[PDB]
């Protein structure tokens, strides 16, 4: 159960975010609206929201998910592989302090980590290795998790750019899997829910106090979720999709 959410308002320089596709550039005017709709969605999940102001110096700052990992025992300020984002950790640490007084950790060079590559299952965190999360980084992470009585294995990435890009743990041993992940050994004791190819983007959803927020326009996937009896909530994030961003990326939940 979550009691807090953290989000940051999209910067105008958002059009110059770190994309890796020819999905086109995002429309600030439209993106700013989707974010709002996003927040209003969370306003109905019995959590209190700490909405941070937009910082133009970081296009992708709206993706607070990556900068930090928030656990039930501590918080780990990560270290963004992408340097244009590495500063984001500093503009959020104050908020992190307020919530985790005296219990704040941080990744030190040369290792790097982006919480987007981490999935939280119970007290275990799966850390998929990517271009953004190198071996050293992940190592320190598990090191820290262990320090505070927590665990964290590692997962190997074939196709997907980030861990929670084809996965989503909706609690109750329910996993959303797309692409490779569907048969990845590690998650065979989970109620793997397959996401069809054309809808692989909906593999990135978030479970919030029994409600489940997902991108708008992915019916099939949507169906399966309502199936399980989750109060599904659709939010159009198309403009974030343009820069590999989704519902999980846009917030910290703890």
From Swiss-Prot:
Inhibited by zinc ions. Competitively inhibited by lysine. It comes from the Bacteria. InterPro entries: DDAH, DDAH-like. Substrate binds at residues 18, 60, 65-66, 85, 132, 243. Zn(2+) binds at residues 162, 249. One of its GO terms (biological process) is positive regulation of nitric oxide biosynthetic process. Coiled coil: none annotated. One of its GO terms (molecular function) is metal ion binding. Pfam families: DDAH_eukar (PF19420). The keyword Hydrolase applies. Belongs to the DDAH family. Hydrolyzes N(G),N(G)-dimethyl-L-arginine (ADMA) and N(G)-monomethyl-L-arginine (MMA). PANTHER family: DIMETHYLARGININASE, DIMETHYLARGININE DIMETHYLAMINOHYDROLASE. NCBIfam families: DiMArgaseDdah. This is N(G),N(G)-dimethylarginine dimethylaminohydrolase. It comes from Pseudomonas aeruginosa (strain ATCC 15692 / DSM 22644 / CIP 104116 / JCM 14847 / LMG 12228 / 1C / PRS 101 / PAO1).
């Amino acid at each position: 159960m979550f009691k807090h959410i953290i989000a940051r308002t999209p910067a105008r320089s958002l059009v110059d975010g770190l994309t890796s596709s020819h999905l086109g550039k995002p429309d600030y005017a439209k993106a700013l609206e989707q974010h709002n709709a996003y927040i209003r969605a969370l306003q109905t999940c019995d959590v209190d929201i700490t909405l941070l102001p937009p910082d133009e110096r970081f296009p992708d700052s709206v993706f607070v998910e990556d900068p930090v990992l928030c656990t039930s025992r501590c918080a780990i300020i990560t270290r963004p592989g992408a340097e244009s984002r590495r500063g984001e950790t500093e503009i959020i640490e104050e908020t992190v302090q307020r919530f985790y007084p005296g219990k704040v950790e941080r990744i030190e060079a040369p290792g790097t980590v982006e919480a987007g590559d981490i999935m939280m299952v119970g007290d275990h965190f799966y850390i998929g290795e990517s271009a953004r999360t190198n071996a050293e980084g992940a190592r320190q992470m598990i090191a820290i998790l262990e320090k505070h009585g927590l665990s964290g294995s590692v997962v190997r990435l074939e196709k997907v750019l980030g861990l929670k890009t084809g996965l989503a743990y909706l609690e109750h041993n329910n996993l959303l899997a797309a692409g490779e992940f569907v048969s990845k050994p590690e998650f065979q004791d989970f109620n793997i829910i397959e996401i069809p190819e054309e809808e692989s983007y909906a593999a990135n959803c978030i479970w919030v106090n029994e409600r489940v927020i997902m991108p708008a326009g992915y019916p099939r996937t949507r169906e399966k979720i309502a199936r399980l009896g989750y109060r599904v909530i659709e939010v159009d994030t198309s403009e974030y999709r343009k820069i590999d961003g989704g519902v999980s990326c846009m917030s910290l939940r703890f």
